[PDB]
Symmetry: C2
Subunit: 473 residues, 2 copies
């Protein structure tokens, strides 16, 4: 009985008959007290931190373990700091923290129903409910995936399988290259997925985006015609609802109409912007999404669910059985549910439905509508700050709570603007304790604000522009 031996610490596991209740309660409380201290005092740590691994033979002491946690926390990025305004990575909702505690504690497996009796059923039903908010219709549904890249991968795998019947024989027999279309501003997980799917990164054909970083439907139509002429076999168009760099939304209805005209799978990568389904004031921006063949949506971004939390939704969930699931005996439960492992890229999977369901209930649709509004308000203040300053330039109009801008100062030649913006970013972080990201975009370095932290204020944005004004004179 290993847990009686001198070879395991008394608290290595939790005795299911309570025999080490007191000792585990103590260890758990130390971690809990420490994490809560770090989080209720998060503003004491900056948005980014200032900075010999061996697996020990013998059990580490509580002191070593607590010190490691302390060092792990102190050396981590800190989106909780009101100054953290640079990424689609938010401080987590409290119930998402607690949801993951519960999930880890019960340690169920989304691979199959018998390994996750309630969570599998909860996830299937919750995702049907969400697919309904997107307007996908009564056959719609999907699966949670560990990150949006996997959601896009699985959407693209289904589009491919549908077009080429490739589940069993593969795609190596093809005389014509399969290709997909996406905005020149669409997410890189498309190229990574295209590589993984056997299509190659070059199978993702870029469609011109406007000055406001939205896909150009006229150019979509042109690229499809060009592809056919070159003897390629288009099978999918990806529209993006909230691009990663600038946060803009493609014209989903127009793009979707073109895809449908040409018999192409219509996927909407709504990883970020999908959260607008909870805002009546803003969801008109997603008009057209209801006719998608599939949708990628990431609650871990604008719904504040602790990473990872993402899903792929299909307007006809049965497609996962016809053009994804590998040949195998089909065992459905008496209440209709199926093993989720058969119809996802992953087999074993963490129960993300716990944090998702708990966060959605604690915040509510109105809670998210208000957060979404405040996000837009903060962003509009940044837009106005940039308009007021002639040495700054916007990337273009905004569609979400994201503002990409940069310095283009006339006291420097263009070739020096990348150093100016890197330097401004460094200065804002060092002296302002304000974190902006600095993506490459349109061949240059642009500053990027993602206004997500619930505790970011007008004053933080004003502090930013004062530092920018100092840096520029």
């Amino acid at each position: 009985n290993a847990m009686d031996s001198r070879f395991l610490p008394a608290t290595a596991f939790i005795d299911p008959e309570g025999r080490n209740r007191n000792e585990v309660e103590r260890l758990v409380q130390q971690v809990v007290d420490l994490i809560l201290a770090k989080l209720t005092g998060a503003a004491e740590r900056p948005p980014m931190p200032e900075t010999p691994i061996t697996i020990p033979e013998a059990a580490a002491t509580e002191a070593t373990l607590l010190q490691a946690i302390r060092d792990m926390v102190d050396g981590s990025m800190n989106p909780a700091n009101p100054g953290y305004i640079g990424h689609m990575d938010p401080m987590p909702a409290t119930m998402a923290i607690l949801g993951d505690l519960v999930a880890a504690a019960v340690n169920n497996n989304m691979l199959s129903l018998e390994m996750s009796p309630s969570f599998s059923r909860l996830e299937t039903l919750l995702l049907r409910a969400i697919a309904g908010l997107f307007g996908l219709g009564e056959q719609a549904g999907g699966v949670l995936t560990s990150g949006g890249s996997l959601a896009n991968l699985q959407a693209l795998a289904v589009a491919r399988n549908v077009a080429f019947d490739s589940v069993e024989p593969g795609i190596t027999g093809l005389a014509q290259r399969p290709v997909i279309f996406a905005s020149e501003a669409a997410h890189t997980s498309l190229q990574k997925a295209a590589m993984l799917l056997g299509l190659g990164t070059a199978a993702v054909i870029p469609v011109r985006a406007t000055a406001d970083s939205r896909m150009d439907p006229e150019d979509l139509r042109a690229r499809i015609d060009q592809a056919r002429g070159a003897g390629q076999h288009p099978f999918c168009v990806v529209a993006t609802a909230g691009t990663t760099t600038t946060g803009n939304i493609d014209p989903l209805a127009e793009i979707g109409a073109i895809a449908r005209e040409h018999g192409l799978w219509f996927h909407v990568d709504a990883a970020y912007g999908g959260a607008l389904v909870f805002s009546e004031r803003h969801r008109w921006r997603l008009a057209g999404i209801e006719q998608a063949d599939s949708i990628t949506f990431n609650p871990q971004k604008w719904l504040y669910v602790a990473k990872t939390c993402a899903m792929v939704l299909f307007r006809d969930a049965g497609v996962l059985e016809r053009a994804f699931r590998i040949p195998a005996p089909q065992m459905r439960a008496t209440d209709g549910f199926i093993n989720l492992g058969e119809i996802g890229v992953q087999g074993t999977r963490h129960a993300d439905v716990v944090k998702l369901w708990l966060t959605l209930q604690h915040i509510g649709q109105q809670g998210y509508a208000r957060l979404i509004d405040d996000g837009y308000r903060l962003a509009e203040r940044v837009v106005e700050g940039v308009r007021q300053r002639p040495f700054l330039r916007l990337a273009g109009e905004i569609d979400t709570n994201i503002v990409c801008f940069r310095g283009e100062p006339d006291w420097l030649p263009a070739e020096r603007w990348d150093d100016w913006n890197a330097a401004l970013q460094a200065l804002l972080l060092r002296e302002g304790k304000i974190f902006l990201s600095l993506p490459v975009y349109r061949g240059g370095r642009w500053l990027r604000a993602v206004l997500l932290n619930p505790y970011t204020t007008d004053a933080v944005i004003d502090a930013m522009f004062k530092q920018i004004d100092r840096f520029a004179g």
Copy 2:
């Protein structure tokens, strides 16, 4: 502005300046106390548990949320029950629970260094150490993945890219079908991977396994030769260290040698059996694994890390930059580290390294060696029990703490054996409070014991056979 609202509960987020500190502490404490009650009393719940879903307009109350947690726990499978002896799914190490609490609190992202300054470096360094423990050499390392299926996918994607130079142009132009070889007992994530990679499920050619469910080397050589004669293009052999159903280990050194003789990528799926690296008494079972081109290993199974925790290791970690990573500017920190999203299937990714690192430190290599030995002793007790009962048959020799066996009673014709075993399994659960799984194997229904719960005892195994004896009329 939102947190100063009627529209948000005072505890929806944690105020970074402490202004909701007391309310947060109490909510957290109620969930902590409830979860600890459920776990310290887990044996009160059976191994298996005995609408409509609406996203509310308004914030749920604390009472509703706590009740939902109670309902979710009570409706979940319960591997902490000493009777739960049926799957590669363990009760979690205490520090792995706590690790996920820490990871979710700081909510960093493994996608890039900038988003996980400490965790990215800790993961890269830790997996280099683990790869070294598998004996893969100085250049070896890898990445954590959300599950072993992804680890297998990534390893096969690399094998494919190396063989066919397919990162940019894909594989559609190929005139010969790419194929891989794996034991007829190997994991289905190979077929799913093969489908995903564009090879098709049928690209996975099954190799005959012995009566003890280990891959036959002679049949492997024949299948490779047959593939080449059939116009196909072999590029990878997958050996399995701990098959999912029976827990057996392919002869890794012999299979590796044959892979190498034919110039094929050698991948070892050690999802389960890779935990033997922490056991001096049993790690010889993995001999040969040190020459693998890649290894899949799942701490979430036999190292008790709460799901998910898995990795893919490469003997040359550099291969991820040459034959996987998509064309892009290479950002590299001054201390050498790279953005991990560029060299994984996933982009954004939960920080699994936290619970992995805390659990490995708390249990230690000595701890795992003890856990593993006791697993083998329980498995050996099941084997002995089966051998004593003529109406039961073992699937074959065991290589790990897994025993697959079934009834083959001579008082029934063979076509009734599936029902007998299904009835036995159902009776063990209902009457014995003992969970065995019941996979399809060799065309029939087999009982399957995975002896993982550290609180599973000889008494449990004895109770199991008592029930078995009663069901069969002694």
